[model samples]
Target: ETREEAVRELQEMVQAQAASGEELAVAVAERVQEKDSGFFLRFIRARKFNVGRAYELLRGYVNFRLQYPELFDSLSPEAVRCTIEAGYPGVLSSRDKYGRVVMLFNIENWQSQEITFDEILQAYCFILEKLLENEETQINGFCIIENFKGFTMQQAASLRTSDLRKMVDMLQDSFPAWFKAIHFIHQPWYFTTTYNVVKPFLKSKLLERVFVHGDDLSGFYQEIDENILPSDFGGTLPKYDGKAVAEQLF
Candidate 1:
């Protein structure tokens, strides 16, 4: 289909899903845009890491960005790198067993930034490219939360923590309102359209959660203490909260 035609159809789909209140598959279009950078960045900082599950959850965010780039070109590569680095130690970058690079984010430091939603989207897109070769692999679903220090880049995470926090604080209190209005603002129509177009092709429930709750992070750990790790930090991997945790999520 022509680009314009495709966009039109996608918009219609999003509208339908929003009306139904049925969660849609995370769409690369909305998740990877420059507009939602702040939300995504905040999510990275506020989520729990060390547990390993948080990183897995973060991967879903990465998947969408990798899956859709035609819609995410609004930003540059530098901006993308900035977002990835913001997630830091808990949020690590590395190659998987198959030589595919994966970026994992911890949960403890999630949501500590004022990054524009657009930047978050861009970062996820960049990581997704590295991990799944832009979603060309057979591993359709990936999610886990436990200690997996085997793949972390702790130094990168520590170096950027303070700076990212300060920058986000500035954006929240001092940044121009106009910037939010222009590049960072999200519209209902955008949500509806993206959901409608992307839901049909989702590979699993994990992807769906990323699309809905990932953006509307109202239900995440309402508060965070920066000093805490995922309980699995020191020696071995953290144990999973098989009951309450999994029930709340899957």
Candidate 2:
């Protein structure tokens, strides 16, 4: 469909939902700060302008927050500063040639004992929400680099399947953000095995965008310009600094 047609359809979808007064619609109208068509259009675009699919995803997005009230209620940058400082997940300052933002996750840096899975997830969600604030990031999308160097089986064992399922659901189906690709670098054999346990929960389209690179990041570079990547990944950019990001975010 043409851009005009898509925009009109999205507007109509938004009107229909607001008029329906469904549980999700009512909740969104009352709780969400932003209910403009421009804001709702992002979800519609993420779902390829399919009104029904976008509506379902929008409901899921609200439902996810409702299910985790504590996380949403008390989630503040200061609250998750420790996780951010530890570099559990960081966003690069540079954008790829395609204008997509790059996010990095250092599994080795994760202090499972010091931080809980929920906090880490909260930090990630916070970062994602901040990134989506940029129009370029919203349109161009985002990519992730999961660095697993020095990762151990014990670290892998800390992941609970239930939490993983929730994460996958949020990232893949609920959220409106466009996830371009996910590159797993320096993955050990055990890491790959552990990842397989959550593979069933991943959508086929998401699976296709996932590239597992073991040590050699040549394939990752082919997908994303090396210049935008950090030196650790054979790029010219500096490594991600989580503290700096935290300061900017909070």
Candidate 3:
């Protein structure tokens, strides 16, 4: 893919549609802290150098922030420190065999009563923004391992469908990264019931990558190696350090 041509095409698409309402150009420059050819180039590269689709991803990235300031506004590590420390979205120190970032979330460690689900959303967004800063991650993408071993009905009820829906869209449409696999392990009997609520919002493209490995890490190991995983997930690796991973973002 010709980076120069893709960047040129992407720039023209933005300038051509410079309008007062829901403008991509303005957000591209002023709001998003992204005004360079390389930054625009990243979005273009993400869409397989297809400038038109990159335009859509760019537009969605900006529009999502406009649509929901609650999630993006003043998004800081301070606000989500509690959430990350609880491992709402913890990153493994090592990368997967494919060189993808391996992120973990053990719901059993979460304190729903203390921190709201929306903050958990913010925590991942925080991690993703930082992760995407590394060009390697932008190309290799991310895969999530979510453990729901001790998750309870009360915890599920605490989560809102509205927030869950936004999570699906923000990650799939708004963000410029490859979410390779989303494996669910040791899920309680109720995982599907909760998953069904957000199932419809996911595009078929994303749906293909989502897996349910209830109590089975054997199959999960094939997609993502055991070394990158922590001891809690039937891996020999040591337990993931909570605050240490989140603190690295700073």
Query: What TM-score fits each model?
Result: 0.28, 0.82, 0.87
Candidate 3 residue lDDT tens string, 1-250: 5788888877887766665544566775455445666678667767788888888788778877777789877776686876788777789887888789888888884776677777887888788877776778878888888888878888887777888888787778677356788888888877778899998888888888889998767788898877667887667878766778867776
After superposition, the stretches of candidate 3 with alpha carbons farther than 4 Å from their true spots are 1-9, 19-30
Instruction: Say which prediction, candidate 1 or candidate 3, comes out ahead on lDDT.
Output: 3
Please tell me which model should have the higher TM-score, number 1 or number 2.
2
What is the C-alpha local distance difference test score of each model? Answer: 0.33, 0.74, 0.78
In model 3, the worst 10-residue window by lDDT is 28-37
- Top candidate by lDDT: 3
- RMSD (Å) of each candidate, 1 decimal: 18.7, 3.6, 2.6
What is the model-wide C-alpha lDDT for candidate 2?
A: 0.74
Model 3, CA-based lDDT? 0.78
- Give the least accurate 10-residue stretch of model 1, judged by summed lDDT: 176-185
Candidate 2 Cα outliers beyond 4 Å, as residue runs: 1-26, 33-38, 44-56
